[PDB]
Short mmCIF file of C-alpha atoms and ligand atoms in Angstrom, two decimals:
data_model
loop_
_atom_site.label_atom_id
_atom_site.label_comp_id
_atom_site.label_asym_id
_atom_site.label_seq_id
_atom_site.Cartn_x
_atom_site.Cartn_y
_atom_site.Cartn_z
CA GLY A 13 0.90 -29.85 32.09
CA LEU A 14 3.72 -29.32 29.55
CA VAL A 15 2.41 -27.48 26.48
CA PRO A 16 2.75 -29.80 23.43
CA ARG A 17 6.00 -28.80 21.76
CA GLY A 18 4.85 -28.54 18.14
CA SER A 19 5.80 -25.11 16.81
CA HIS A 20 3.57 -23.09 14.44
CA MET A 21 3.79 -19.74 12.64
CA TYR A 22 1.35 -16.90 13.34
CA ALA A 23 0.85 -13.56 11.63
CA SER A 24 2.35 -10.97 14.00
CA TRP A 25 2.17 -7.92 11.72
CA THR A 26 0.49 -7.40 8.34
CA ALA A 27 0.03 -4.68 5.73
CA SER A 28 -2.45 -4.92 2.89
CA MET A 29 -1.02 -4.23 -0.57
CA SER A 30 -2.24 -1.63 -3.05
CA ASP A 31 -1.15 -0.80 -6.60
CA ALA A 32 0.25 2.75 -6.45
CA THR A 33 -0.34 3.19 -10.21
CA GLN A 34 -4.06 2.49 -10.09
CA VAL A 35 -6.32 5.54 -10.37
CA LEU A 36 -10.01 6.36 -10.58
CA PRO A 37 -11.86 6.30 -13.91
CA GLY A 38 -10.93 9.35 -15.94
CA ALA A 39 -7.91 10.17 -13.77
CA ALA A 40 -4.46 10.88 -15.09
CA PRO A 41 -1.87 8.08 -14.74
CA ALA A 42 0.05 7.82 -11.46
CA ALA A 43 3.74 6.91 -11.33
CA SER A 44 5.20 4.29 -9.03
CA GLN A 45 8.08 4.86 -6.64
CA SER A 46 11.39 3.45 -7.82
CA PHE A 47 14.64 2.51 -6.08
CA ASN A 48 18.07 2.20 -7.72
CA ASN A 49 21.01 0.96 -5.68
CA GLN A 50 19.22 1.95 -2.49
CA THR A 51 18.15 0.54 0.89
CA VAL A 52 14.73 1.00 2.50
CA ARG A 53 14.55 0.34 6.24
CA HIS A 54 11.00 -0.24 7.47
CA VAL A 55 9.94 -0.29 11.13
CA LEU A 56 7.00 -2.35 12.40
CA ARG A 57 5.40 -3.30 15.72
CA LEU A 58 5.05 -7.02 16.46
CA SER A 59 1.77 -8.10 18.02
CA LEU A 60 2.97 -11.65 18.83
CA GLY A 61 6.35 -12.72 20.15
CA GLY A 62 8.09 -16.05 19.72
CA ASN A 63 11.29 -17.87 18.87
CA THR A 64 11.76 -17.52 15.09
CA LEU A 65 10.25 -15.29 12.42
CA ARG A 66 9.79 -15.08 8.66
CA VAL A 67 9.21 -12.15 6.30
CA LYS A 68 6.67 -12.02 3.48
CA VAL A 69 7.61 -9.75 0.58
CA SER A 70 5.42 -8.84 -2.38
CA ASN A 71 5.47 -7.94 -6.09
CA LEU A 72 1.71 -8.44 -6.31
CA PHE A 73 1.12 -5.35 -8.46
CA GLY A 74 4.46 -5.19 -10.25
CA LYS A 75 4.40 -5.00 -14.03
CA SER A 76 7.78 -6.80 -14.25
CA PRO A 77 9.94 -8.83 -11.86
CA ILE A 78 11.79 -7.27 -8.96
CA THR A 79 14.90 -8.60 -7.24
CA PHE A 80 15.42 -8.07 -3.52
CA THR A 81 19.22 -8.06 -3.46
CA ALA A 82 19.27 -8.42 0.32
CA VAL A 83 16.68 -8.51 3.09
CA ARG A 84 17.67 -8.21 6.76
CA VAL A 85 15.93 -7.96 10.13
CA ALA A 86 16.97 -6.52 13.51
CA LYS A 87 15.51 -5.14 16.68
CA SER A 88 14.73 -1.43 16.37
CA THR A 89 16.10 1.08 18.86
CA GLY A 90 14.11 4.02 17.55
CA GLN A 91 14.04 6.08 14.32
CA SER A 92 16.29 4.26 11.77
CA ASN A 93 18.53 2.79 14.49
CA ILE A 94 18.92 -0.95 15.12
CA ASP A 95 20.63 -3.19 17.68
CA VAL A 96 23.35 -4.55 15.41
CA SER A 97 23.86 -7.55 17.70
CA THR A 98 20.35 -8.71 16.60
CA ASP A 99 20.94 -8.20 12.86
CA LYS A 100 20.08 -11.34 10.83
CA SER A 101 20.14 -12.27 7.16
CA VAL A 102 16.70 -13.07 5.73
CA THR A 103 17.06 -15.86 3.16
CA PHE A 104 14.78 -17.45 0.59
CA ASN A 105 15.44 -21.16 0.00
CA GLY A 106 18.86 -20.41 1.49
CA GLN A 107 19.63 -17.51 -0.91
CA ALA A 108 20.21 -13.94 0.21
CA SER A 109 18.85 -12.48 -3.05
CA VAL A 110 15.43 -13.38 -4.45
CA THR A 111 13.45 -12.48 -7.56
CA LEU A 112 9.63 -12.25 -7.47
CA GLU A 113 7.73 -12.39 -10.78
CA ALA A 114 5.09 -9.77 -11.31
CA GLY A 115 1.87 -10.75 -9.53
CA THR A 116 3.55 -12.97 -6.89
CA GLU A 117 4.43 -12.89 -3.19
CA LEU A 118 6.90 -14.93 -1.15
CA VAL A 119 7.54 -15.78 2.52
CA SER A 120 11.16 -16.18 3.60
CA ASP A 121 12.97 -18.95 5.43
CA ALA A 122 12.68 -18.85 9.20
CA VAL A 123 15.09 -16.47 10.96
CA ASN A 124 16.46 -17.40 14.39
CA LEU A 125 15.61 -14.22 16.28
CA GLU A 126 13.71 -14.33 19.56
CA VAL A 127 11.21 -11.47 19.82
CA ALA A 128 8.68 -10.12 22.38
CA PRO A 129 5.12 -8.87 21.85
CA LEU A 130 4.55 -5.14 21.33
CA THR A 131 8.17 -4.51 20.36
CA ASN A 132 9.46 -2.89 17.14
CA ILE A 133 11.71 -4.53 14.57
CA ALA A 134 13.34 -3.13 11.45
CA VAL A 135 13.09 -4.92 8.09
CA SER A 136 15.64 -3.57 5.62
CA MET A 137 15.66 -4.20 1.83
CA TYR A 138 18.47 -3.46 -0.63
CA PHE A 139 17.64 -3.10 -4.35
CA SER A 140 20.86 -3.06 -6.36
CA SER A 141 19.15 -2.58 -9.73
CA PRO A 142 16.59 -0.02 -10.99
CA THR A 143 13.44 -1.33 -9.29
CA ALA A 144 9.89 -0.08 -9.81
CA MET A 145 7.78 -0.72 -6.65
CA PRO A 146 4.10 -0.10 -7.32
CA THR A 147 3.24 -2.76 -4.67
CA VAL A 148 2.93 -0.72 -1.46
CA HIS A 149 1.09 -0.25 1.72
CA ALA A 150 0.38 3.40 1.02
CA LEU A 151 -0.57 4.73 4.48
CA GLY A 152 1.98 3.32 6.87
CA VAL A 153 1.52 5.94 9.63
CA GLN A 154 5.15 5.02 10.25
CA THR A 155 8.46 6.49 9.04
CA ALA A 156 10.61 4.48 6.63
CA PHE A 157 14.22 5.40 5.92
CA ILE A 158 15.90 5.34 2.48
CA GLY A 159 19.62 5.55 1.74
CA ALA A 160 22.23 4.87 -0.90
CA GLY A 161 23.94 1.53 -1.40
CA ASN A 162 23.49 -1.55 0.76
CA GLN A 163 22.85 -0.25 4.27
CA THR A 164 20.67 -3.22 5.35
CA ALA A 165 23.09 -4.15 8.18
CA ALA A 166 24.05 -0.58 9.15
CA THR A 167 23.41 0.72 12.67
CA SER A 168 21.37 3.57 11.17
CA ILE A 169 20.38 4.80 7.72
CA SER A 170 22.61 7.62 6.49
CA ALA A 171 20.61 9.86 4.18
CA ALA A 172 18.76 13.13 3.90
CA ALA A 173 15.58 13.52 5.96
CA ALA A 174 13.68 14.48 2.78
CA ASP A 175 14.33 10.90 1.51
CA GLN A 176 12.05 9.39 4.17
CA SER A 177 8.64 7.85 3.45
CA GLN A 178 5.55 6.80 5.35
CA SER A 179 4.74 3.78 3.13
CA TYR A 180 5.77 0.11 3.14
CA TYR A 181 7.39 -1.11 -0.08
CA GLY A 182 6.74 -4.75 -1.01
CA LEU A 183 6.52 -5.81 2.66
CA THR A 184 3.20 -7.42 3.62
CA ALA A 185 3.57 -9.76 6.60
CA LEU A 186 5.78 -10.73 9.50
CA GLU A 187 5.07 -14.17 10.99
CA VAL A 188 6.49 -15.46 14.29
CA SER A 189 6.60 -19.00 15.65
CA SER A 190 5.37 -20.31 19.02
CA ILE A 191 4.29 -23.51 20.70
CA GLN A 192 1.55 -21.72 22.67
CA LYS A 193 -2.17 -21.65 21.89
CA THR A 194 -2.53 -18.46 19.89
CA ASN A 195 -5.39 -16.37 18.46
CA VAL A 196 -4.94 -13.99 15.51
CA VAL A 197 -7.50 -11.21 15.12
CA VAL A 198 -7.57 -9.61 11.65
CA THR A 199 -8.96 -6.07 11.53
CA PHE A 200 -10.23 -5.55 7.96
CA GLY A 201 -11.29 -2.09 6.76
CA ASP A 202 -10.53 1.33 5.31
CA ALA A 203 -8.64 4.37 6.70
CA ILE A 204 -10.44 4.07 10.04
CA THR A 205 -8.85 0.61 10.49
CA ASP A 206 -5.55 1.58 8.75
CA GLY A 207 -5.25 4.42 11.26
CA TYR A 208 -5.31 7.65 9.22
CA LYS A 209 -4.97 10.71 11.55
CA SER A 210 -3.48 8.63 14.36
CA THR A 211 -0.02 9.84 15.48
CA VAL A 212 2.82 8.79 13.16
CA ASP A 213 5.33 6.38 14.75
CA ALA A 214 3.23 6.19 17.95
CA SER A 215 1.31 2.89 17.41
CA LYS A 216 -2.06 4.54 18.08
CA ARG A 217 -4.09 2.92 15.27
CA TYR A 218 -7.25 1.38 16.72
CA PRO A 219 -5.94 -2.18 16.29
CA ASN A 220 -2.76 -1.15 18.16
CA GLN A 221 -4.85 0.16 21.04
CA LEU A 222 -6.96 -3.01 21.05
CA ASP A 223 -3.70 -4.97 21.20
CA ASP A 224 -2.66 -2.82 24.17
CA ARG A 225 -5.87 -3.74 26.01
CA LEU A 226 -5.35 -7.46 25.29
CA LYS A 227 -1.79 -7.54 26.61
CA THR A 228 -2.70 -5.40 29.62
CA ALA A 229 -5.40 -7.98 30.43
CA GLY A 230 -2.76 -10.72 30.20
CA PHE A 231 -3.55 -12.15 26.74
CA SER A 232 -0.09 -12.00 25.27
CA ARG A 233 -1.06 -14.86 22.89
CA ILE A 234 -4.00 -13.00 21.30
CA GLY A 235 -2.58 -11.10 18.34
CA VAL A 236 -4.09 -8.24 16.30
CA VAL A 237 -2.99 -7.62 12.71
CA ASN A 238 -4.07 -4.70 10.51
CA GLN A 239 -5.60 -5.28 7.07
CA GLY A 240 -6.97 -1.80 6.61
CA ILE A 241 -6.39 0.23 3.44
CA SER A 242 -7.01 3.97 3.52
CA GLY A 243 -9.73 4.77 0.99
CA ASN A 244 -10.84 1.16 0.48
CA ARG A 245 -14.28 0.21 -0.85
CA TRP A 246 -16.21 -3.09 -0.83
CA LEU A 247 -17.40 -2.89 -4.41
CA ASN A 248 -14.83 -1.06 -6.56
CA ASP A 249 -11.07 -0.79 -6.90
CA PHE A 250 -9.33 2.36 -5.54
CA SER A 251 -8.12 3.03 -3.03
CA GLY A 252 -6.57 -0.45 -3.04
CA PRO A 253 -8.20 -3.55 -4.52
CA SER A 254 -11.92 -3.82 -3.81
CA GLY A 255 -12.80 -5.36 -0.44
CA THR A 256 -14.60 -8.21 -2.16
CA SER A 257 -11.59 -9.03 -4.34
CA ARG A 258 -8.97 -8.87 -1.53
CA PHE A 259 -10.94 -10.68 1.21
CA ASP A 260 -9.42 -14.12 0.46
CA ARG A 261 -5.84 -12.78 0.49
CA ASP A 262 -6.11 -10.20 3.29
CA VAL A 263 -8.44 -12.11 5.65
CA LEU A 264 -8.99 -15.80 4.89
CA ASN A 265 -5.33 -16.53 4.04
CA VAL A 266 -3.70 -14.75 7.00
CA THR A 267 -1.52 -17.26 8.84
CA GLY A 268 -3.25 -18.48 12.00
CA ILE A 269 -6.40 -16.29 11.66
CA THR A 270 -9.02 -17.15 14.26
CA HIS A 271 -11.15 -13.96 14.36
CA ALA A 272 -12.00 -11.11 12.01
CA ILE A 273 -13.36 -7.61 12.70
CA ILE A 274 -14.86 -6.14 9.54
CA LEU A 275 -15.46 -2.37 9.29
CA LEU A 276 -15.90 -1.26 5.67
CA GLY A 277 -18.32 0.63 3.49
CA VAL A 278 -18.25 4.35 4.21
CA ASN A 279 -16.16 4.97 1.10
CA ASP A 280 -18.59 2.99 -1.07
CA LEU A 281 -21.18 5.54 0.08
CA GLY A 282 -18.98 8.64 0.00
CA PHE A 283 -17.13 8.24 -3.29
CA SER A 284 -20.09 8.56 -5.62
CA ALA A 285 -21.00 12.23 -5.05
CA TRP A 286 -17.83 13.55 -6.64
CA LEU A 287 -14.75 11.28 -6.63
CA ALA A 288 -16.35 8.52 -8.72
CA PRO A 289 -19.83 9.44 -9.99
CA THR A 290 -20.01 6.40 -12.31
CA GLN A 291 -19.64 4.13 -9.24
CA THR A 292 -22.86 4.74 -7.30
CA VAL A 293 -23.81 1.67 -5.26
CA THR A 294 -26.87 0.77 -3.20
CA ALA A 295 -26.96 -0.33 0.43
CA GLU A 296 -28.25 -3.63 -0.97
CA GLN A 297 -25.13 -4.11 -3.10
CA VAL A 298 -22.90 -3.45 -0.07
CA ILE A 299 -24.95 -5.88 2.03
CA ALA A 300 -24.61 -8.57 -0.66
CA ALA A 301 -20.81 -8.18 -0.69
CA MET A 302 -20.71 -8.33 3.11
CA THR A 303 -22.91 -11.44 3.06
CA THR A 304 -20.58 -13.36 0.72
CA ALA A 305 -17.53 -12.40 2.80
CA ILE A 306 -19.26 -13.50 6.03
CA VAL A 307 -20.25 -16.83 4.49
CA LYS A 308 -16.70 -17.49 3.30
CA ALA A 309 -15.14 -16.68 6.67
CA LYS A 310 -17.64 -18.75 8.65
CA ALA A 311 -17.05 -21.73 6.35
CA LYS A 312 -13.38 -21.55 7.35
CA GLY A 313 -14.28 -21.56 11.07
CA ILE A 314 -13.28 -17.93 11.63
CA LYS A 315 -15.27 -15.95 14.21
CA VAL A 316 -16.74 -13.00 12.30
CA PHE A 317 -17.57 -9.61 13.86
CA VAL A 318 -18.89 -6.67 11.84
CA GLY A 319 -18.60 -3.08 13.01
CA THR A 320 -21.34 -0.50 12.47
CA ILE A 321 -20.44 2.35 10.15
CA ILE A 322 -19.41 5.39 12.27
CA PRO A 323 -21.36 8.67 11.78
CA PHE A 324 -19.76 11.08 9.33
CA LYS A 325 -22.08 14.05 8.87
CA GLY A 326 -19.93 17.09 8.14
CA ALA A 327 -17.43 15.16 5.98
CA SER A 328 -17.11 17.27 2.79
CA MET A 329 -20.82 18.02 2.68
CA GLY A 330 -22.32 17.54 -0.77
CA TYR A 331 -19.10 15.96 -2.05
CA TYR A 332 -18.74 12.87 0.15
CA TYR A 333 -21.40 12.89 2.85
CA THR A 334 -24.88 13.33 1.34
CA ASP A 335 -28.45 12.51 2.33
CA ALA A 336 -28.19 9.46 0.08
CA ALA A 337 -25.00 8.31 1.82
CA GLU A 338 -26.68 8.67 5.25
CA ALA A 339 -29.72 6.66 4.20
CA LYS A 340 -27.51 3.85 2.93
CA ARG A 341 -25.47 3.97 6.16
CA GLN A 342 -28.60 3.46 8.23
CA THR A 343 -29.79 0.58 6.06
CA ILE A 344 -26.38 -1.11 6.35
CA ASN A 345 -26.19 -0.58 10.11
CA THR A 346 -29.72 -1.95 10.59
CA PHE A 347 -28.64 -5.02 8.62
CA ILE A 348 -25.53 -5.49 10.78
CA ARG A 349 -27.41 -5.05 14.06
CA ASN A 350 -30.06 -7.60 13.07
CA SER A 351 -27.83 -10.17 11.35
CA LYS A 352 -27.97 -13.63 12.85
CA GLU A 353 -25.23 -14.84 10.47
CA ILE A 354 -22.40 -12.83 12.04
CA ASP A 355 -20.93 -13.96 15.34
CA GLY A 356 -21.40 -10.52 16.85
CA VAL A 357 -21.77 -6.79 16.25
CA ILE A 358 -19.12 -4.33 17.39
CA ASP A 359 -21.08 -1.09 17.66
CA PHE A 360 -18.37 1.45 16.79
CA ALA A 361 -21.09 3.90 15.71
CA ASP A 362 -22.70 3.87 19.15
CA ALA A 363 -19.29 4.22 20.83
CA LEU A 364 -18.09 7.18 18.77
CA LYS A 365 -21.28 9.11 18.01
CA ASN A 366 -21.92 12.63 19.33
CA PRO A 367 -24.36 12.50 22.27
CA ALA A 368 -25.71 15.86 21.08
CA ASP A 369 -26.31 14.61 17.50
CA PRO A 370 -26.00 10.89 16.60
CA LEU A 371 -25.29 11.66 12.93
CA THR A 372 -21.91 13.24 13.78
CA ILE A 373 -18.77 11.91 15.41
CA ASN A 374 -18.28 12.96 19.02
CA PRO A 375 -16.25 16.21 18.85
CA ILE A 376 -13.72 14.90 21.36
CA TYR A 377 -13.01 11.99 18.96
CA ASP A 378 -13.02 14.04 15.73
CA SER A 379 -9.63 14.48 14.06
CA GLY A 380 -11.09 17.60 12.43
CA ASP A 381 -12.51 16.30 9.13
CA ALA A 382 -15.72 14.79 10.61
CA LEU A 383 -14.71 11.39 9.20
CA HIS A 384 -11.50 10.09 10.78
CA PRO A 385 -11.08 9.62 14.56
CA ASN A 386 -8.15 11.13 16.43
CA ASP A 387 -5.94 9.12 18.80
CA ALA A 388 -8.59 9.40 21.50
CA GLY A 389 -11.26 8.20 19.07
CA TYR A 390 -9.18 5.20 18.10
CA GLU A 391 -8.66 4.55 21.81
CA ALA A 392 -12.44 4.67 22.28
CA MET A 393 -12.99 2.25 19.39
CA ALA A 394 -10.62 -0.21 21.04
CA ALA A 395 -12.26 0.32 24.44
CA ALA A 396 -15.72 -0.55 23.05
CA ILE A 397 -14.71 -4.13 22.19
CA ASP A 398 -15.69 -6.97 24.51
CA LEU A 399 -12.43 -8.91 24.85
CA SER A 400 -14.43 -12.08 25.54
CA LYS A 401 -15.30 -12.02 21.81
CA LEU A 402 -11.62 -12.55 20.90
CA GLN A 403 -11.03 -15.70 23.01
C1 LIG B 1 -12.60 6.62 5.54
C2 LIG B 1 -11.49 6.71 4.48
O1 LIG B 1 -11.00 5.65 4.10
O2 LIG B 1 -11.01 8.04 4.25
C3 LIG B 1 -10.09 8.61 3.18
C4 LIG B 1 -10.71 9.15 1.85
C5 LIG B 1 -11.44 10.47 2.12
O3 LIG B 1 -10.46 11.42 2.62
C6 LIG B 1 -12.13 11.18 0.92
C7 LIG B 1 -12.54 12.51 1.58
C8 LIG B 1 -13.37 13.55 0.79
C9 LIG B 1 -12.70 14.20 -0.41
O4 LIG B 1 -11.49 14.87 0.01
C10 LIG B 1 -13.73 15.24 -0.81
C11 LIG B 1 -13.30 16.14 -1.95
O5 LIG B 1 -12.10 16.86 -1.54
C12 LIG B 1 -14.41 17.12 -2.21
C13 LIG B 1 -13.98 18.09 -3.32
O6 LIG B 1 -12.81 18.80 -2.87
C14 LIG B 1 -15.06 19.12 -3.62
C15 LIG B 1 -14.55 20.01 -4.74
O7 LIG B 1 -13.35 20.67 -4.33
C16 LIG B 1 -15.58 21.07 -5.13
C17 LIG B 1 -14.98 21.88 -6.28
O8 LIG B 1 -15.90 22.90 -6.70
O9 LIG B 1 -13.05 12.38 2.92
C18 LIG B 1 -13.20 13.64 3.46
C19 LIG B 1 -11.87 14.43 3.67
O10 LIG B 1 -14.27 14.13 3.79
C20 LIG B 1 -9.02 7.57 2.92
C21 LIG B 1 -7.72 8.09 2.22
O11 LIG B 1 -7.97 8.64 0.93
C22 LIG B 1 -6.94 9.12 3.09
C23 LIG B 1 -5.62 9.34 2.34
O12 LIG B 1 -5.88 9.97 1.10
C24 LIG B 1 -4.64 10.24 3.14
C25 LIG B 1 -3.30 10.31 2.37
C26 LIG B 1 -2.29 11.16 3.14
O13 LIG B 1 -3.52 10.85 1.06
CL1 CL B 2 -18.20 -5.62 21.41
CL1 CL B 3 -13.79 -6.17 27.77
#
């Protein structure tokens, strides 16, 4: 019959936030990016279409307030170009400018812009004042465009090509409304979820390719949002807040979440040889963190899938991969494969391993560093997933 007409918002695109000034123990301080009387135009791919949208901005890791002088949205026509006929003001309690205190985030008013799944929109921000922006999604795998003055409504960004970036600045979610029954699948992880080594501006991150499979199969109302952070660890901050500490924000609190795919831990194992020797952790400590996350998500009624840790022998031997890291990987994967608490295993390790040597990534899927898949490897990750799990 007629679908009940009550409208609801769903996360259509997400980006997990990191503090660009946070560094490893003993490391030299790191400076944040700043803007001063400048516009940043971001581009992002929507997983879910619908009738209206809203924008979530962030000063989560600011050390002082920031003021978004203007925020605008439009359909992207490639590079920095927009369809000016679709340009809309993004307001916050009716105001075009909004100030976020340090440590806070804010979702905008609804914007009347009809959008389709797997299309790109541009979200443009003007900062009139000197604005420090430590709150970023560092690894965007996507070009952002920076220019002088308020260009938020301009057809393109006029600037030098050296002013571009591949990060997202203070932009963390895009939510879209619909009356239809809708699933939201959150992919939670490290660089292998974030999509490091996939082709920039090509939407070839593994969650993008999973999304492609869903829409090709007809499931336009099953969305996939990305909560990976390159370099992320369960148990310790850097890169990004620890997985344990960000799970509530980046998984449980995602608007409309129904399913989660968790793939995290290789950095907990790999960082201790050299990057962070004071932060050695056991497989048991990783398993305990996973357990608490699984319990929390199941209590919220989320379907929880855990991926096996992909082989990584050859990845900076002696300085990331070690015999100790391999032993812990096998203990963790045994735990995953035998868990009766999770709703299912997604065996990424089995899908991507080298048939000639199961401790290495299949050479046809190796980006070249023995750790991160290439586009074909991210395609193979997506292909391994039983879409019945996401219903
Ligand atoms: C899964 C995940 O999240 O992955 C990534 C981290 C991972 O890349 C860490 C490295 C290994 C280190 O580099 C190894 C050191 O280099 C060894 C040192 O050099 C030895 C020393 O020189 C001897 C001197 O005697 O994994 C690798 C490459 O194996 C996530 C993220 O950080 C990627 C991001 O940073 C890319 C952005 C554009 O920055
Ligand atoms: Cl599966
Ligand atoms: Cl399938």
